[PDB]
Amino acid sequence: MGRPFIIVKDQGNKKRQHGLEAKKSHILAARSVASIIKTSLGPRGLDKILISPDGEITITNDGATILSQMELDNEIAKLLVQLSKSQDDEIGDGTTGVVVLASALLDQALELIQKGIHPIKIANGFDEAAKLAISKLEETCDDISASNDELFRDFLLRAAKTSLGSKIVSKDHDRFAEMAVEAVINVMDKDRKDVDFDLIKMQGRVGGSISDSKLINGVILDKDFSHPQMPKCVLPKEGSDGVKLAILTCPFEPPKPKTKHKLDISSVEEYQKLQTYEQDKFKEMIDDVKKAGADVVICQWGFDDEANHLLLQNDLPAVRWVGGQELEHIAISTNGRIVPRFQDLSKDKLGTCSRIYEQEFGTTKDRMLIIEQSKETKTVTCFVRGSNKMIVDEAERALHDSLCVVRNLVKDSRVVYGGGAAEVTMSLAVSEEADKQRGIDQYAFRGFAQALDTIPMTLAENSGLDPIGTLSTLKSKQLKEKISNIGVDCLGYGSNDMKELFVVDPFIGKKQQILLATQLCRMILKIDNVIISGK
Amino acid sequence: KSSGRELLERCARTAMSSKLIHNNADFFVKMCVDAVLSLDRNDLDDKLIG
Ligand SMILES: Nc1ncnc2c1ncn2[C@@H]1O[C@H](COP(=O)(O)OP(=O)(O)O)[C@@H](O)[C@H]1O
Ligand SMILES: [Mg+2]
Structure with a gap:
C-alpha cells in the first residue's frame, strides 16, 4: 500500500463526525438557536434585527423570518429553519414555540443517551408520549x-x-x-x-x-390616471349607483396581428385610404364604451397619446399600465367579467364600485387608487x-x-387556552402514565414531560416571575382541580385564570407544536455519520 | 387459502423498519398497500406512484 489513499473524491474538505461526541455536538448546537429566540417567546418577547447582504435590514421577533434569510453552516440548525417554515406555512402561528420545544426534546434526550439507552429507543418513547398528550388535551378541549x-x-x-x-x-x-x-x-x-x-x-x-x-x-392600485386633469373622485349620477367599471385586457392601439406582417401601400390612393381607416377606429373604440355605459377603463398597456384625451372629452376616466394580476382581483370585488375584446363589451360584464377617489401622500408624488363597496363584497x-x-x-x-x-x-x-395552560395539562398526563407502566420507557416519558414544562417556565422567566414558583403552582391547581384554564400570566394580573383574561388559542396550532418538534428530533437522534464538505 | 390483501400488509411492514415510519407504520402501510392494488396486476409502474 502506497502513501496516497483515495476512495471518495475530495477527502480534504469532507469531514466525518461520529461517536458519542457527535450526538453531544449537534444537540448542544440546536440549543443555541432556541436560546436566541427564548427571550422572544410570549408578549414580553423581544424583536431581532436581520441584516441582508444587500444592505436591507429587517426587524422581527417571528422565528420563521428570523431563521429565514440567515447564513448558516451546521445542518442541524438548518433543519430548524425548515421547521419554523413548516409551522408558518400551514398554521401561520407558533413558529417560535416549536423550535424551543424541539430543542427541549434534545436537551432532555442528551442526558438519556449517556445513560446507555439507544437513541431510537429514546425517540420511540416520544411518539407514544405525544399521542397521550394530544388525546388528553382533546378531551378537555371546548367546542365553540x-x-x-x-x-x-x-x-x-x-x-x-x-x-x-x-x-x-x-x-x-x-x-x-x-x-x-x-x-x-x-x-x-x-x-x-x-x-x-x-x-x-x-x-x-x-x-x-x-x-x-x-x-x-376594494382594490388598492398605485397607478395614477392616464390624464392629470380628470376629477380625482368618481361618483354615480341619478340611479344605477354602479359606475359600470370596465376591465379590458386590450388597450387602445392600432389593430395589428401578433405574427410578423407587412402592409404594402400603392402610391397616394392607398396611402389616403389608410388615413381614414385608423381615424375611424378611435371613433369606433369610443362608441363601444358609450354604448355600454362604461366609465373607468383599465388595461395592461398604456393608451396612445391620441387615446388619452379622447376619453377626457367624454368624461371617461382611465388607468393604464395595470399589472395582469391586479386586473383579476378587481373584477371579483365588482362582480364583473373582464372583457376580452372590443366586440364582446356588454353591460353584463361591467363592474360596480360605490366610490373611487385619487389618494395623495404628503409631499411625495404618487397616486393610490381606492375602490370602496357600500355593501358586503x-x-x-x-x-x-x-x-x-x-x-x-x-x-x-x-x-x-x-x-x-x-x-x-x-x-x-375546537380551541384551547394557551399561556402555559395547555403545556402543563399535557405534561402531567405523561407523568401519570410513566409510573403506571414503569419498564425501560419510563425515562423517555419523563424526559418528554419535562420538555413540555420548558414553555411555561420560559414565559415566566421573560416576564420576571420565578420559574420554580410558577411551575409548582400550575401543577398544584392542575392535579387537584380538573380545570385546565390555569396558566402562566406574563402581564402580572392578580389571577392566573386564562379564561378571564380572554386568552384563546386554536387547537390545530398547538397540536402541530408537539407534532413538528417530535418528528424532527427523531431523525436527529438517528443521525450518526455526518459528512460535511467544505465550500 | 388466506386472503390476498393481508398478504401484502405483513410484507410491507417489514420494509418500514429502520425508517421513520416504524412508529407511524400503522397509518402509512395502509396507503402503499392500496396503491399497488389500483395498478394492473399485469403492468406495474413506478412512474404512476410518483
Ligand atoms: N396576553 C397573554 N396572556 C397569556 N399568554 C400569552 C399572551 N400572549 C401570548 N401568550 C402566550 O405566548 C405564546 C407565544 O405567542 P406569540 O409570541 O404571540 O406567537 P408564537 O406562538 O409564534 O411565539 C403563546 O403560546 C401564548 O399562549
Ligand atoms: Mg404568534
Whole structure:
C-alpha cells in the first residue's frame, strides 16, 4: 500500500463526525438557536434585527423570518429553519414555540443517551408520549361551534388579541383586532365555512402613523390616471349607483396581428385610404364604451397619446399600465367579467364600485387608487400605515399572523387556552402514565414531560416571575382541580385564570407544536455519520 | 387459502423498519398497500406512484 489513499473524491474538505461526541455536538448546537429566540417567546418577547447582504435590514421577533434569510453552516440548525417554515406555512402561528420545544426534546434526550439507552429507543418513547398528550388535551378541549354567529364573532377576537400581543402592534390590540376579524367575516360562507385566504389582500404603505390604518373593502392600485386633469373622485349620477367599471385586457392601439406582417401601400390612393381607416377606429373604440355605459377603463398597456384625451372629452376616466394580476382581483370585488375584446363589451360584464377617489401622500408624488363597496363584497384589502418602513413591514407580518389564527377557527372550531395552560395539562398526563407502566420507557416519558414544562417556565422567566414558583403552582391547581384554564400570566394580573383574561388559542396550532418538534428530533437522534464538505 | 390483501400488509411492514415510519407504520402501510392494488396486476409502474 502506497502513501496516497483515495476512495471518495475530495477527502480534504469532507469531514466525518461520529461517536458519542457527535450526538453531544449537534444537540448542544440546536440549543443555541432556541436560546436566541427564548427571550422572544410570549408578549414580553423581544424583536431581532436581520441584516441582508444587500444592505436591507429587517426587524422581527417571528422565528420563521428570523431563521429565514440567515447564513448558516451546521445542518442541524438548518433543519430548524425548515421547521419554523413548516409551522408558518400551514398554521401561520407558533413558529417560535416549536423550535424551543424541539430543542427541549434534545436537551432532555442528551442526558438519556449517556445513560446507555439507544437513541431510537429514546425517540420511540416520544411518539407514544405525544399521542397521550394530544388525546388528553382533546378531551378537555371546548367546542365553540354550538353558539350562534353573535358569540362566534367575539370568539375570534379572543384568538386575535393573543397573537397580536407579542408584536409592535400590541400598542392597541382592541382597535386592530376588528380589522382582522371583519376582513374574514366578509368571505365566510355562514355554513360549512371556508376562509379562502386568497380573497384577502394586504397592501402596506410607508408613512403617517399606525393608528391611521383602516379596513377598506376594494382594490388598492398605485397607478395614477392616464390624464392629470380628470376629477380625482368618481361618483354615480341619478340611479344605477354602479359606475359600470370596465376591465379590458386590450388597450387602445392600432389593430395589428401578433405574427410578423407587412402592409404594402400603392402610391397616394392607398396611402389616403389608410388615413381614414385608423381615424375611424378611435371613433369606433369610443362608441363601444358609450354604448355600454362604461366609465373607468383599465388595461395592461398604456393608451396612445391620441387615446388619452379622447376619453377626457367624454368624461371617461382611465388607468393604464395595470399589472395582469391586479386586473383579476378587481373584477371579483365588482362582480364583473373582464372583457376580452372590443366586440364582446356588454353591460353584463361591467363592474360596480360605490366610490373611487385619487389618494395623495404628503409631499411625495404618487397616486393610490381606492375602490370602496357600500355593501358586503367578495374580497377585502388590508391598509396599513407606519412611521417607519420596517414598522410597516412588521405590521404586515403581525397582521398576517392574526389572519392565520382566525382562519384556524373557521375550519376547526375546537380551541384551547394557551399561556402555559395547555403545556402543563399535557405534561402531567405523561407523568401519570410513566409510573403506571414503569419498564425501560419510563425515562423517555419523563424526559418528554419535562420538555413540555420548558414553555411555561420560559414565559415566566421573560416576564420576571420565578420559574420554580410558577411551575409548582400550575401543577398544584392542575392535579387537584380538573380545570385546565390555569396558566402562566406574563402581564402580572392578580389571577392566573386564562379564561378571564380572554386568552384563546386554536387547537390545530398547538397540536402541530408537539407534532413538528417530535418528528424532527427523531431523525436527529438517528443521525450518526455526518459528512460535511467544505465550500 | 388466506386472503390476498393481508398478504401484502405483513410484507410491507417489514420494509418500514429502520425508517421513520416504524412508529407511524400503522397509518402509512395502509396507503402503499392500496396503491399497488389500483395498478394492473399485469403492468406495474413506478412512474404512476410518483
Ligand atoms: N396576553 C397573554 N396572556 C397569556 N399568554 C400569552 C399572551 N400572549 C401570548 N401568550 C402566550 O405566548 C405564546 C407565544 O405567542 P406569540 O409570541 O404571540 O406567537 P408564537 O406562538 O409564534 O411565539 C403563546 O403560546 C401564548 O399562549
Ligand atoms: Mg404568534
